[PDB]
Design a protein around this ligand. Sequence first.
Ligand SMILES: Nc1c(C(=O)N[C@@H](CC(=O)O)C(=O)O)ncn1[C@@H]1O[C@H](COP(=O)(O)O)[C@@H](O)[C@@H]1O
Ligand SMILES: N[C@@H](CC(=O)O)C(=O)O
Ligand SMILES: N[C@@H](CC(=O)O)C(=O)O
Length: 299
Amino acid sequence: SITKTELDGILPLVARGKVRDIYEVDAGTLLFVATDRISAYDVIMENSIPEKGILLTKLSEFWFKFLSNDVRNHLVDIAPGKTIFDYLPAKLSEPKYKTQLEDRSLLVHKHKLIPLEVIVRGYITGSAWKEYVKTGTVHGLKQPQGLKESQEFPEPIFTPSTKDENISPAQAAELVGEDLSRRVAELAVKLYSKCKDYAKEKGIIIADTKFEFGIDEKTNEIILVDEVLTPDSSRFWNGASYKVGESQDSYDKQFLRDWLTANKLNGVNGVKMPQDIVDRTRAKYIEAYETLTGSKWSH
Ligand SMILES: Nc1c(C(=O)N[C@@H](CC(=O)O)C(=O)O)ncn1[C@@H]1O[C@H](COP(=O)(O)O)[C@@H](O)[C@@H]1O
Ligand SMILES: N[C@@H](CC(=O)O)C(=O)O
Ligand SMILES: N[C@@H](CC(=O)O)C(=O)O
């Protein structure tokens, strides 16, 4: 497993998120490295899930391609017969560094930020359900009465947050502009509905998802950026066992979650997962990848 990338200053680090290490390649280009780190109850585990970041990188790439005729994206085009390593300093091809980067790294164009977490919810769960139980609203938006936990909304809804506080679409328009916010909300719902319909047919319900969007202002054009419709950016549910009126198991994280709670380790830093938990969680990522892409992992 790749837990933390160590590139010895060959490229400068921009950020380390929960799961992604980002490096600056040049003035216009970034390198997004998905590690095998995993989070639960808002803390990362001490050890990692081997090849998780390769699986989620490939899943994100799958969705980018699936949506390529719906939305422009930030991916740098790799010439045929070339690899990402051809676009990186020569040192990064040395075995010490190539092992940390291969199959889990994406070369991306820097675009102008749209500073919103563009969340779309097809089903009422998570912080939407919590609010709705209290006040019958979701991100301050008025909702129909009588919704049950995990129920599908009449239509998927744009419910933004700021990097995390849940905000209304009207606040999103204050933050990024009235016209832009509307275009963003409309595109997000469209992209979500298309992918959700496809995933459900494959047996996975994507309950909600967090997109990040950018803008190429030289051509006023919305760009799909960040990771796309993975179990880290979205809520994956088993479609066959779906039941309204209760919480659904996390498709990818329930085995881990169950272990943590059983040991009162939820929210605790520095927790090492036992091997059985690691192995089963890994197998769950492979299954999601194979189910959604149609590709075989390891065969
Ligand atoms: N909430 C997450 C999370 C997350 O918290 N993951 C846990 C992992 C876990 O315990 O399951 C972590 O430890 O960070 N990741 C993404 N999203 C996305 O955020 C969108 C809104 O989620 P909310 O919880 O506010 O309904 C919603 O569209 C997405 O689900
Ligand atoms: N390939 C273009 C995007 C596109 O062709 O849609 C870019 O990297 O900016
Ligand atoms: N029409 C927006 C500008 C934008 O969409 O960026 C505004 O409220 O100024």
